[PDB]
């Protein structure tokens, strides 16, 4: 259950509040009855409220409006930028940082024993959030061979076997495998080739990944309020 709570504003009236919220002034008597208010409902200052603190409310006192409010179906335009940042952060999850020391496991991508946990510098375990989290998960999936992870046959990639010849065919195989691996992630809305080239031994390519938009993540997290889990089991 959730309800709206209104702070009394300067020289406000109960009729104005009723019109503002219920869309009709007629509910002002219901508002009085629910809040248990005596006749001078909104006193000028606290000196009047001292006469009867129980039954009177002054400026800056909080009223309760029993309208069933719900965090979903709320216009994203009202939400504050920091609130949107936190919401997308929750949507994309928090996880322990393992992709630290990028250079090392970039020098040995195909091998095992390549990544490890790290500390945040404050004596606690390091954590990656939001975009850093997505980076970590996409790197780990691409680096993981498919079928090597226990309890998860399909998680991973087949790039360890695509160390083939230097022709456009193997390039296309790599590209298709990478697109499969990126598509496998639920959060990745789509992925597509940008550009590739061959330099004899070395292959080089780059991709573009569109994560779910702020609106979708906001809708998902605010929907999750009904359950209260606020966690990711994808």
């Amino acid at each position: 259950m959730r309800f709206k709570k209104h702070v009394v504003q300067h020289e406000e009236t109960m009729q104005a509040i009723a019109q503002r919220y219920y869309g009709d002034v007629s509910y002002w008597i219901d508002l009085v009855e629910h809040n248990n208010l005596k006749y001078p409902y909104l006193v000028e200052t606290d000196e009047e409220k001292m006469k009867d603190p129980e039954r009177l409310a002054s400026t800056g006192d909080t009223l309760i409006i029993p309208i069933e409010s719900d965090l979903t179906d709320v216009s994203a335009k009202e939400i504050n930028s920091r609130d949107k940042d936190v919401l997308v952060e929750l949507a994309l999850g928090r996880d322990l940082n393992i992709t630290a020391d990028e250079k090392y496991f970039n020098e040995h991508g195909t091998s095992d024993n390549i990544l490890a946990f790290s500390t945040n510098g404050n004596g606690d375990l390091d954590t990656v959030k939001g975009i850093d989290n997505m980076k970590q998960q996409l790197q780990a999936r691409l680096l993981t061979p498919r079928g090597s992870l226990m309890l998860h046959p399909n998680y991973g990639s087949d790039l360890h076997n695509l160390f083939g010849l230097n022709i456009p065919e193997q390039a296309t195989l790599i590209e298709m495998e990478v697109l499969r691996t990126l598509t496998s992630d639920n959060r990745v809305k789509s992925a597509n080739l940008i550009d590739w080239k061959i330099q004899g031994n070395v292959y080089s390519g780059q991709f573009s990944v569109e994560i779910k938009s702020v609106e979708e993540s906001i809708n998902f997290v605010l929907g999750q309020d009904e359950e209260g889990i606020f966690a990711l089991f994808e």
Partner: protein
């Protein structure tokens, strides 16, 4: 070897217009800037005071445009509480009189034959006990000879454990010279002592302390065959006891002794500085744009005005909002505006009340309102105006009339006008005027217009420095420079941060080191008069 590689890019996901505050606080170190993101982080750092209230107000000034990465500072020249007992030195982390009430006190446990420490600080509901001080390992004997003893002594030149010896009767089985060798820690010592045929140096059951070998205390001639004698090393072990949990640090100047549960002393908040020049300098290169001092003093206002001008001279443009007093007459406001007469300074006239999240109906002076206005301005986009934006102030000490507002705005003073039955709040900001009263000049007079110009110049300067300086000069450089500029100008237009720009006017010339550039822009504005005329017509 052959291997796969992977890269990730993130520059496409994304100035921030950081906001600053200096004022009085009940906690935190002096002369030290901090970056704040959460209210819990500020509450841990700043225990109380007006500065914490200002941070809360700033992150709650507006429903839709609360600021971020607020930079805070404590002006109090406070000191931490400390005390001395025996050979110990006791010093608290907290600065100010709050550390005086931290309770510290050493005891002894007869069952374990070990010192005990207990620290209590009832303000934070802190209560912990560090039992089993010292008592690093137990030496035990399993033979059937006449006697068995050990001995550890210090080297007086360095107070390091010179030797560690096990004896049967009078002669030695094996001696570990701890001043040398690889036996730097006690665990290297016990691992080899346990290998002896009839001797054990079992590490104490009270956790794996693993203390330095050189810091062992001075014990000699104790029966192993009759007792599981304890080598202690109380001071070195106190580092393990207070390794991670503990408000109070310890040091040894000597011998340590138990003592009563004594409170600390010497904790001083200190008087506030008269001039904030040394305090203000710390924000020289912090990247902040809006700064508001938490003081009603005209001297501080002049100091901040000098500081923001100097930073703007150094290529780091900054603006300030000031205020003070409770219910200041219009004469004082005009005197303050005439004294300042700075484009990069804004004066706030109204003072009122704010409803904190804690429930306090805090009646505050005018500079707290200037904080709130600064936090709302920083929350806005680059070049967007604070005109007619809601403030969510509970009440105000005055309600100025339509003539008083017109006089304040004509004198380059910001003011707030009471308004009824609007959807958001019962108050709004009338104008974003500066103290410079030359209304003909739109850059100096309007806060928004000059902020747009300053952020445009700073971003152009940073990007040009980052990109092309220090690179190569080739045929494609000029075209590339023109393309990069046009892309930047198209980005700015797309974000509504300018009105428009002609693309053909952009010119680039390259000759040796120099790169001469020129361009034209139509700058951003926000409406300040809206006119509507109607025409009536009929048919017969």
């Amino acid at each position: 070897r052959p291997h796969a590689s992977i890269e990730v890019d993130t520059s496409g996901i994304g100035s921030e217009k950081v906001f600053c505050l200096i004022g009085q606080a009940e906690g935190g170190e002096p002369n030290t800037v901090y970056e704040l993101r959460n209210y819990s982080q500020a509450k841990r750092l700043f225990r109380s005071g007006e500065l914490l209230d200002a941070i809360e107000l700033a992150w709650g000034s507006n429903p839709n445009y609360t600021a971020g990465r607020i930079l805070a500072m404590r002006i109090e020249d406070a000191k931490p509480a400390s005390a001395e007992i025996g050979g110990l030195k006791i010093t608290s982390k907290i600065y100010g009189n709050v550390a005086n009430n931290i309770q510290v006190g050493l005891e002894k446990n007869t069952l374990s034959d070990s010192l005990r420490l207990r620290v209590i600080f009832q303000d934070d509901r802190f209560n912990e006990v560090y039992d089993n001080i010292g008592n690093i390992f137990t030496i035990k004997y399993k033979g059937e000879e006449a006697n068995a003893t050990f001995s550890v002594e210090h080297d007086e030149e360095t107070q390091k454990a010179s030797r560690l010896v096990l004896k049967v009767g009078d002669q030695e089985v094996k001696s570990y010279d701890l001043t040398g060798g690889a036996y730097d820690y006690t665990n290297a010592i016990i691992t080899d002592i346990n290998q002896l045929p009839d001797f054990e140096a079992k590490l104490s059951p009270f956790g794996d302390k693993n203390l330095e070998s050189s810091k062992l205390d001075k014990i000699e001639n104790a029966n192993i065959k009759d007792k599981a004698v304890y080598v202690k090393a109380v001071f070195g072990d106190l580092e393990k006891q207070t390794a991670y949990n503990g408000i109070v640090s310890f040091e040894q100047l000597k011998t340590i002794e138990p003592f009563e549960l004594t409170k600390l002393k010497g904790g001083t908040n200190g008087e506030p500085p008269a001039t904030w020049a040394d305090k203000l300098d710390k924000f020289a290169h912090e990247g902040g744009y809006y700064i508001v001092p938490l003081s009603s003093k005209q001297s501080v206002h002049a100091e901040v005005a000098s500081f923001v001008k100097e930073r703007s001279d150094a290529g780091e443009p900054m603006r300030a909002i000031v205020g003070g007093g409770f219910n200041e007459s219009k004469e004082q406001l005009f005197g303050r505006q005439a004294s300042l007469s700075n484009p990069r300074v804004s004066l706030v006239a109204n003072s009122g009340t704010f409803v904190m999240d804690d429930g306090r109906k805090n009646h505050v002076p005018a500079y707290m309102v200037a904080v709130a206005l600064g936090g709302l301005a920083s929350g806005l986009e680059i070049g967007e105006s604070i005109t007619f934006k809601p403030l969510r102030v509970s009440s105000l000490d005055q309600i100025y009339e339509s003539i008083d507002l017109d006089e304040l705005n004509e004198n380059g003073i910001i003011s707030i006008e009471f308004v009824r039955n609007r959807t958001n709040t019962f108050f709004r900001i009338v104008d974003d005027v500066t103290t410079f009263n030359d209304k003909s000049d739109p850059v100096k007079a309007e806060m928004a217009v000059g902020e747009a110009n300053d952020f445009l110049v700073s971003e152009l300067k940073v990007q040009l420095e980052d990109q092309f300086i220090g690179t190569r000069t080739i045929n494609t450089s000029a075209s590339i420079i023109k393309d990069f500029i046009q892309s930047y100008l198209g980005r700015k237009k797309r974000d509504n941060e300018i009105q428009d720009f002609p693309a053909e006017d952009v010119q680039v010339i390259v000759e040796g080191n120099e790169a001469r550039i020129s361009m034209t822009v139509y700058p951003i504005r926000s409406f300040k008069k809206i006119s509507v005329s109607l025409v009536y017509k009929q048919q017969t």
